[PDB]
Ligand binder design. Structure first.
Ligand SMILES: [Mg+2]
Ligand SMILES: [Mg+2]
Lengths: 157, 158
DNA sequence: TCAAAACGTCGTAC
DNA sequence: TCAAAACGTCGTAC
DNA sequence: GACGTTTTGA
DNA sequence: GACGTTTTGA
C-alpha cells in the first residue's frame, strides 16, 4: 500500500507546514442549542497554483475546492464523518499538528450526541483547547458563551 | 529504507509549502569577477516550534539552524556540494518546487567552473530563471548586471 | 580570493 | 432543525 | 492562516 | 518567503 503512504506522508508534510486542523463554535440561530461545533481540515495555496488543492482532493477522495476573491484557493474537509477518515490517514505522519488532530478526533466522537447540552458543552470546551494551539487570535466565541446561553435556555449543563 | 523515504516525502511535503529553493547573484567585492551565484534550500518556521528545524537537520544530516531577531527560525542548506545531496533526496517527491530544484541542480553543475567568465554567465542567467518562479520579486541584481560589469573587467562573454 | 555561516527585514501568501 | 457548501477579509508567519 | 458570515439543501 | 548584508574562515 506504500505508494499511498508516500502520498499521505507528503500531504502530512504539506498540512504541517500550511494547513489548519481546527474546531470552531459557530452561532446558528435555527439550532435549538444555538451553537454548532464546526470541525475542519483546511489547506491554502495561491490561486496561481490552484491545481495542487485539486490533487490533494483526489488523494483524499473527500473535500471541496474553492477560489477566494483575494487570489487564494482553499481545500476544505468539514464534518466528522469525512474528517475522521482523513485525519486517520494523516495521523501517523503529522508532527506539528498531531495535537490539533487528536483533539478534533475526540470532538468528532461527541458530534453524534451534540443535541444533549452537556455533550455540546463538552465539545465546546474541547474546541477551545484546539483554539489554544492555533496562532489565531480571532477566536471570539468561546465555551463561556455556549454555557451562558445554554444556562439561559433553561438547560442544566 | 522505506522509512527514510517516508521522512523525505513528509519533508518534501513541508518544503513545497514553506520552503525556498533559490539561486541568487550576490556581489562579493573580493571576487575576481565580482559576483557569486548562491544556491540554497531554506525552510521557515516560527521560533515557537524551533524544534522542527532541528528535526529536519537531523533527517538530512546537513545544514544550519538560526534564530532570527523577529521571532522566526530558518533551517538552511547553502552551497553546491551539500545542497545537491539534499535535492536528490527530495526530487522524487517535490511537486510544487521541482522546477526550482532541477534548475538549481543545473546550476550546481557549473559552480566548480565558475572562475570562467562565460561559465559564470550561464550560471547567472539560470539564476534569473529560478527567480521567475520564486515569486517575491525583491531582487534588483540580475544577469544583465553581471554580464555588463564582466564586460568592463575586460572579459569577453557572449 | 573563495564561499559558508550567520544575519535583518519588507511584502505577501497565507 | 440541522450542517455542509461556499463565502470575505485582516493579521502575521512566513 | 483563522477566523466569522451567507447560502444551499437534507 | 525571499531577498540583500556582515562575519567567519578555509
Ligand atoms: Mg506555516
Ligand atoms: Mg506556502
Amino acid at each position: 500500500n506504500f505508494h499511498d503512504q508516500l502520498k499521505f506522508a507528503w500531504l502530512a508534510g504539506f498540512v504541517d507546514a500550511d494547513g489548519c486542523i481546527n474546531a470552531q463554535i459557530v452561532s446558528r440561530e435555527d439550532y435549538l442549542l444555538k451553537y454548532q461545533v464546526r470541525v475542519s481540515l483546511t489547506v491554502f495555496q495561491s490561486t496561481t497554483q490552484h491545481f495542487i488543492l485539486l490533487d490533494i482532493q483526489k488523494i483524499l477522495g473527500c473535500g471541496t475546492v474553492r477560489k477566494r476573491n483575494d487570489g487564494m484557493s482553499e481545500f476544505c474537509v468539514v464534518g466528522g464523518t469525512s474528517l475522521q477518515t482523513t485525519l486517520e490517514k494523516l495521523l501517523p505522519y503529522l508532527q506539528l499538528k498531531r495535537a490539533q488532530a487528536k483533539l478534533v478526533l475526540q470532538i468528532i466522537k461527541k458530534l453524534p450526541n451534540t443535541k444533549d447540552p452537556s455533550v455540546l458543552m463538552e465539545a465546546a470546551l474541547l474546541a477551545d483547547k484546539v483554539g489554544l494551539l492555533t496562532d489565531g487570535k480571532k477566536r471570539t466565541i468561546l465555551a463561556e458563551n455556549v454555557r451562558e446561553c445554554l444556562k439561559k435556555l433553561g438547560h442544566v449543563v
